[PDB]
């Protein structure tokens, strides 16, 4: 069983620029673990599988969250630290292109369709339960949990937005953009580490370790 009510509850329960951005990322990794434990059935997976799923998904999970947090922000993002970061600041820090991808492919699209918190929660749970994650002791089990989330999401969309038959597909079709953006943000982060100027705190640094 995978009730959207429980997923919404998980979201509600947890509610230069590059230095501040990395600080926010590290901060939210702690909260991300708290979020995942509140998603039905996650805590009952083997510990090693919970580790695999969070290591695979954390960046996409956190990016989805800050993007949705930013829907009422004009040309910017709102960090978990309470700092608003504008386009101009990202551009003047040498990270304009990737910032603009976040704005155009995620934030603006979330804004334009008025993606709600239940929908965001469900998309994040789908990302969490990624059965393609390498090393899972039982991928089939994770696949089944993903299937339950998306079944519940579709039923939710059909019930709440009956006049929008395309909405469920529209939600799912932001996931390729999220995947690509997560990968690019990760690439930048490895570079920040490599150059060694930008402070990277312990949890964020741990996520940059090899498996």
């Amino acid at each position: 069983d995978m009730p959207v009510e429980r997923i919404l509850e998980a979201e509600l329960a947890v509610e230069d620029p590059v230095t501040n951005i990395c600080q926010a990322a590290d901060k939210q990794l702690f909260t991300l673990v708290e979020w995942a434990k509140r998603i039905p059935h996650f805590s009952e997976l083997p510990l090693d599988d919970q580790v695999i799923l969070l290591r695979a998904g954390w960046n996409e999970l956190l990016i989805a969250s800050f993007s949705h947090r930013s829907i009422a922000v004009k040309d910017g993002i709102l960090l978990a630290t309470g700092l608003h970061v504008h386009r101009n600041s990202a551009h003047s820090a040498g990270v304009g292109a990737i910032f603009d991808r976040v704005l155009t492919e995620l934030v603006s699209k979330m804004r334009d369709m008025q993606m709600d918190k239940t929908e965001l929660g469900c998309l994040r749970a789908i990302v969490l339960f990624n059965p393609d994650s390498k090393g899972l002791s039982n991928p089939a089990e994770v696949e089944a949990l993903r299937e339950k989330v998306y079944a519940s999401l579709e039923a939710y969309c059909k019930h709440k937005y009956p006049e929008q038959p395309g909405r469920f597909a529209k939600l799912l079709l932001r996931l390729p953009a999220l995947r690509s953006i997560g990968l690019k943000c990760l690439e930048h982060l490895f570079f920040f580490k490599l150059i060694g100027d930008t402070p990277i705190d312990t949890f964020l640094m741990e996520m940059l370790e090899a498996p």
Binding site: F30, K37, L47, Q50, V51, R55, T202, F203, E206, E209
Partner: peptide, 10 residues
Amino acid sequence: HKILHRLLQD
């Protein structure tokens, strides 16, 4: 991955 394991334990 000691931080993640510790947090997921409790």
